[PDB]
A paper describes a structure:
Very long-chain acyl-CoA dehydrogenase ([name]) is an inner [name] membrane enzyme that catalyzes the first and rate-limiting step of long-chain fatty acid oxidation. Whereas SCAD, MCAD, and LCAD operate as tetramers in the [name] matrix and share considerable sequence homology, [name] is an outlier that localizes to the inner [name] membrane as a dimer and contains a unique additional stretch of 180 amino acids at its C-terminus. The unique C-terminal region is comprised of an α-helical bundle that lies perpendicular to the enzyme and further includes a non-visualized region spanning amino acids 446–478 believed to mediate membrane interaction. Point mutations in human [name] can produce an inborn error of metabolism called [name] deficiency that can lead to severe pathophysiologic consequences, including cardiomyopathy, hypoglycemia, and rhabdomyolysis.
Specifically, on the N-terminal side of the density gap, the structure demonstrated residues through amino acid 459 facing away from the protein, consistent with a module capable of projecting outward to engage a membrane surface. No secondary structure was evident in this region and residues 460–475 remain unresolved, and thus highly flexible, in this structure generated in the solution phase. The HDX MS profile of [name] in solution, evaluated after 10 s, 1 m, 10 m, and 1 h of deuteration, was consistent with the structural organization seen by X-ray crystallography, including general agreement between deuteration and crystallographic B factors. In contrast, the various mainly structured regions, including the α-helical domain 1 (aa 56–165), β-sheet domain (aa 166–276), α-helical domain 2 (aa 277–445), and α-helical domain 3 (aa 479–615), exhibited an overall low level of deuterium uptake that only modestly increased in a time-dependent fashion. Notably, that portion of the C-terminus containing the MBR and not fully resolved by X-ray crystallography (e.g., aa 446–478) displayed a high degree of deuterium uptake from early to late labeling times, consistent with marked flexibility of this region in solution. Taken together, the X-ray crystallography, HDX MS, and liposomal translocation assays indicate that, in solution, the structurally-unresolved portion of the C-terminal region is solvent-exposed, conformationally dynamic, and essential to [name] interaction with cardiolipin-enriched membrane. Interestingly, the structurally unresolved portion of the C-terminal region (e.g., aa 446–478) is predicted to fold as a helix-turn-helix hairpin based on sequence homology to structured proteins in the database.
Residue numbers in the entry:
A (entry chain A), B (entry chain A): 29 to 459, 476 to 615
The structure:
């Protein structure tokens, strides 16, 4: 049985192995080594990098770029014996939180390189591939890029058109295609490329086109790139089209198994996903400091504005979002470091949650700052511009919601359809829930623990009813799936903060009473959202009218090409 | 008694004079004259103005600027006999919807000039002031600016420090101060300036400092400005500090009455406010066309994406927001044109609603577009950058919510405190709601009309209970006031669309059944938000715990200077 909390909750089970107690993974030497890196990495971003300059120049300044290579920042998770820093996922999370606090354009360049660009070599490379490629990737002598998206294919990776055709000898493949919006596409010398190949069925020999992943060197020939694309934010990161024209790729440069490229791509994206939430937890930490500074020092209506309830509630909401996001990021990284094999729903939740949280936190920082927040000099508007893409790339949040909902439903649907389905033998065959977090949550958080268990039961009841009603047709019920994904996001958020705050209380940390407050305040409102949301799905007699009207209104818009009504004057 | 719907709803009354039937104000000649302007103004924005170029140059191109003057666009509401186009508020709304659809940087420059910059001359000018100043304002030979904000004072206008001191003869005032973030500050030759003056009490002679408004000419001497400030969006608009150093202002340049400058400022802002919603209804119309075009033509997962429910719901929500905003804008403009004196709550609602709606619509257009939406070339990201300021200037939306809530409570609180308060004479003194929209809403919208009446009753019940509980101390209950303002916004939104769609049904317009659908879909969810929101205020036993925790969490953040917790590792 799965050890995933998210898998269990869709079945009405409390599977807590990967949640409680809040995981601690580093040994004493790993902790001290990480401390000795945090200091120089922080100083580098404080004293050498200039995020406003990189945004103005639409590139990373050369002194910063070379300094990052010397710091080891292009190879943080590459083993030391292969030229890297040798960090585990939790150690990586700690350093990317520094990068995300300071410069998301630098962060995307380093993440595109190592979180996804060569990550497939770390996960699937042969010994020969690792030894050949990793040392120069880790030094930054060869930058990497993840080459999946094409003009025709973004969310639907299975539809890619770039092709790789084997030679008669089988010594190489000829690769033809183009890729779109590739981070580092104009800088990279190593590309992880996904392309359709003919794959021979091992039993019958029948040939079917399937995706295969390849390690491609720019020096193989036939590779060019377009100019840097101009964009709203993360302007220091390079984004370019990459063109492959008759590229000879050696057969030993297949990454993983021929015809398993889709799984390779998905595993790379899943594996890298926690780093987003970690970086964005850092973004939020720096933004909250700026908002608090402003509210501490601005007088209006005769008081400093932190004395006004509207500002107090904005600040409290911002820190709860940062705390949830940070807690999710380090939970997933710890699960990975502890050998979890089923964390993909939790990782997707962390990416949706953290990207939307950082957006909302930075938008409210602008609001607290007033007119100043819209100005260029304070730098907050630059962060807001940078953040908009994080809801779109590495999986749009809309598609990730559908993934969360359907992946969570999958095992429950398997169980339900197992019911019945045995043949009947007529010839004489002889043959509350009890759920509780007591003993896992700290006693001072018992009430919020009970809110989480009740919300889990409400959620699982709706999941079951909807799978019985829709069966395999649930895949087409998108209004429903988005609402189930939101319930799942809030439920995981509740248990992550219950777990972290409980450990803080048990260990007597100085901030434990504050963390208990963050947790209870989060849980009261998250439990209300799950209660109201699940009632709308199950017992609301107007919900189906809303769904029919969303479809009818959208159809009317598409027929017209835009708004159907004129203004009230009619012209 | 007030004819305002918003005033009535806080008292549990249905005051419908300014709502039903949806107002029609233009006579046949005004309609034809407006049609003859819509065509050349639209062509000018389609064929002459280039919004991407003005954003790149951080100014309005000279050919566009001169063309706008020749079009009459600097004087749209100035009477023809004073050199303007002579439009009423509804006619103005129609043309600013064109500007807002095409270029919000141009829109803010023209609005800062005429919606607020010289608007006080139209509202309060003497005959001599109007004849002297309006002709060159209307031609654009003299650009105007509204000079209220200072480094110390934004939301709290009463706290301004710029001073104007009368001469011994009383022939002039000497003006000293500085103003911050003034739209057109570096371009204007006419400034509406708010400054503190000594004001003599007419009965006793005692002198008190109060604000006075002045018409100030750049040529009076002593006026300089700072360089254009760089900002996230509306980059074509000029924003500059304005400095007043020993400026001699003739006494006949007082605008309105000495010591009534705060009221003048507030009346100017209130009077101009509907133009924001009108412009932003146009912004949303153009953005919805772009989103619909994208969803019509993008194939993913084997279908055009408008076939997927997630996209259908996003599109349907976007058009409902555009329709509500547009309907509010033309309702308020019509009320003004029909001589309403009490429309300030409705105008503030329209500004909060329309600015937040346009932000949300444009953010979702980016999401529908995927990666393309983050790129510069499509132009959507530029619109999103432009829109962020509209939640802040002309009154921050947070302060406008407090205004809506407290202004609505004011007459109800007056009524309640009248209860009792008569002396008792012990010596022998002898001496459902019924509310319905039936007959006002169209019969096909009767159910949504009943939802609105029930929501009004729920709202008014809470307003009464909270005024009894808090009395004059309600001014300090900001968490509550923000939630009451949200209820008021949704209630006005419901009645505005019920009124517009009812007229469409009664008149048999071709889009009436579609409008009925927009209205019912809006009303079902708005009624649910008011039901749940009012229950949280009245009958929820955890609401007070949330409020206490928002204050405690914010206090802990201010004490620390930022997030209190470390990350889970503790360093
Ligand atoms: C700055 C930048 C950097 C990038 N870096 C890289 C990189 O390094 N490597 C890489 O390979 N790619 C990269 N990308 C591409 C990025 O991952 C894609 O933009 C993303 O996957 C979305 O694809 P799309 O833009 O084609 O949108 P589409 O997939 O066409 O989606 C359009 C919209 O429809 C929705 N949608 C799609 N299908 C469905 C469905 N079945 N049901 C409901 N809704 C649906 C989507 O959520 C979205 O809202 C980058 C993009 C940008 C902008
Ligand atoms: C591009 C631009 C153009 C502008 N154009 C002009 C112009 O032409 N003329 C002009 O006069 N001004 C103009 N302004 C100034 C603008 O109106 C002010 O920025 C606005 O009034 C807010 O004031 P502030 O920035 O001082 O914020 P503050 O008033 O200091 O507010 C800071 C924050 O605290 C909140 N807040 C304040 N008081 C309270 C309270 N009592 N309770 C709860 N919350 C509170 C606010 O809502 C905000 O979130 C412009 C500004 C910009 C950025």
């Amino acid at each position: 049985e799965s050890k995933s909390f998210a898998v269990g909750m869709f079945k009405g089970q409390l599977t807590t192995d990967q949640v409680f107690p809040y995981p601690s993974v580093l040994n004493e030497e790993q902790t001290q080594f990480l401390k000795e890196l945090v200091e120089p990495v922080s100083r580098f971003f404080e004293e050498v990098n200039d995020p406003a300059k990189n945004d103005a120049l639409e590139m990373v300044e050369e002194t910063t770029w070379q300094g990052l290579k010397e710091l080891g920042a292009f190879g943080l998770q590459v083993p030391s014996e292969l030229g890297g820093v040798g960090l585990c996922n939790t150690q990586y999370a700690r350093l990317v939180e520094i990068v995300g606090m300071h410069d998301l354009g630098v962060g995307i360049t380093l993440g595109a390189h190592q979180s996804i660009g060569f990550k497939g070599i770390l996960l699937f490379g042969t010994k020969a591939q690792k030894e050949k490629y990793l040392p120069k990737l880790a030094s930054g002598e060869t930058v990497a890029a993840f080459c999946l998206t094409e003009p025709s294919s973004g969310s639907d990776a299975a539809s890619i058109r770039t092709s790789a055709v084997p030679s008669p000898c089988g010594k190489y493949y000829t690769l033809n295609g183009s890729k779109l919006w590739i981070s580092n596409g104009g800088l990279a010398d190593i590309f992880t490329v996904f392309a359709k190949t003919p794959v021979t069925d091992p039993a019958t020999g029948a040939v079917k086109e399937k995706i295969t992943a390849f390690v491609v060197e720019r020096g193989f020939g036939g590779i060019t790139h377009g100019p840097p694309e101009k964009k709203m934010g993360i302007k220091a990161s390079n984004t370019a089209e990459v063109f492959f024209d008759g590229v000879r790729v050696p057969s030993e440069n297949v990454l993983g198994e021929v015809g398993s490229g889709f799984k390779v791509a998905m595993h790379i994206l899943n594996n890298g996903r926690f780093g987003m939430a970690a970086a964005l937890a850092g973004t939020m930490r720096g933004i909250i400091a700026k908002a608090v500074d402003h509210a501490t020092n601005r007088t209006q209506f005769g008081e400093k504005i932190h004395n006004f309830g509207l500002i107090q509630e904005k600040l409290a909401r911002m820190v709860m979002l940062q705390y949830v996001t940070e807690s999710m990021a380090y939970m997933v990284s710890a699960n990975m470091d502890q050998g979890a094999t089923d964390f993909q729903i939790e990782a997707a939740i962390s990416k949706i949650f953290g990207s939307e949280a950082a957006w909302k936190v930075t938008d409210e920082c602008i609001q607290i700052m007033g007119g100043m927040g819209f100005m260029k000099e304070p730098g907050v508007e630059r962060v807001l511009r940078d953040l908009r893409i994080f809801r779109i790339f590495e999986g749009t949040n809309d598609i990730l919601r559908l993934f969360v909902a359907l992946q969570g439903c999958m095992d429950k649907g398997k169980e339900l359809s197992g019911l019945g389905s045995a043949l009947k033998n007529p010839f004489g065959n002889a043959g509350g829930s009890g759920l509780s977090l007591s003993g896992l949550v700290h006693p001072e958080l018992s009430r919020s623990g009970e809110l989480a268990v009740r919300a889990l039961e409400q959620f699982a009841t709706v999941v079951e009813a909807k799978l019985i009603k829709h069966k395999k047709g649930i895949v087409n019920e998108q209004f429903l799936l988005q609402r189930l994904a939101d319930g799942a996001i809030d439920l995981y958020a509740m248990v992550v903060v219950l777990s972290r705050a409980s450990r803080s209380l048990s260990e007597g940390h100085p901030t434990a009473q504050h963390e208990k407050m963050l947790c209870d305040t989060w849980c009261i409102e998250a439990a209300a959202r799950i209660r109201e949301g699940m009632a709308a799905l199950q017992s609301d007699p107007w919900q189906q009218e809303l769904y029919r009207n969303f479809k009818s209104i959208s159809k009317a818009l598409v027929e017209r090409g835009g708004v159907v009504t004129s203004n009230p004057l009619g012209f």
